[PDB]
Design a protein around this ligand. Structure first.
Ligand SMILES: [Li+]
Length: 163
């Protein structure tokens, strides 16, 4: 019966559980991440630039580490946090590691995938897929891993302009 992302609670990268009610009224870009992928640098760099450009306008970027793709997120949370903060200066919201596929996927990802279908098949295909969520907590677009974060900015602006 879940009707929006606000129904879910997740553990942040510091081990602090937070309800996604926190994000009511903001546009969210939800990204599954990994530190040991060939596109790690470009995704984190562009996400941090987009955070800096758009956080004041209502964008919230949420990054969920996940080790389901090629064993590319093997580290624990403290090490992930240190890596991304020291290398990229990440200021957006980082979470504890989850699964995005299978029956043990976080309910947030079960929900996201139930709202926006992937290309051909529905499982998350690799690290750095993106879901765009409007100011009412509705997932309204999904982008494949190879989509540069910058190419999502136009769609973000449309949703930021809405009430
Ligand atoms: Li499928």
């Amino acid at each position: 019966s879940w009707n929006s992302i606000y129904e879910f609670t997740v553990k942040d990268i510091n081990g602090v559980d937070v309800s996604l009610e926190k994000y009511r009224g903001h546009v969210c870009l939800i990204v599954n991440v990994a530190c040991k992928c060939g596109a790690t640098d470009k995704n984190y760099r562009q996400l941090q630039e987009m955070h800096t450009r758009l956080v004041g306008k209502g964008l919230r970027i949420l990054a969920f580490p996940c080790n389901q793709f090629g064993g590319q997120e093997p580290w624990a949370e403290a090490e992930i946090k240190k890596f991304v903060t020291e290398k990229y200066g990440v200021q957006f919201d980082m979470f504890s590691k989850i699964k995005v596929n299978g029956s043990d996927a976080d309910d947030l990802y079960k929900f996201l995938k139930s709202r926006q279908h992937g290309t051909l098949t529905n499982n998350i295909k690799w690290n750095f897929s993106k879901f765009l969520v409007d100011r009412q907590g509705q997932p309204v677009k999904r982008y494949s891993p190879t989509t540069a974060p910058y190419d999502i900015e136009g769609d973000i602006m449309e949703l930021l302009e809405k009430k």
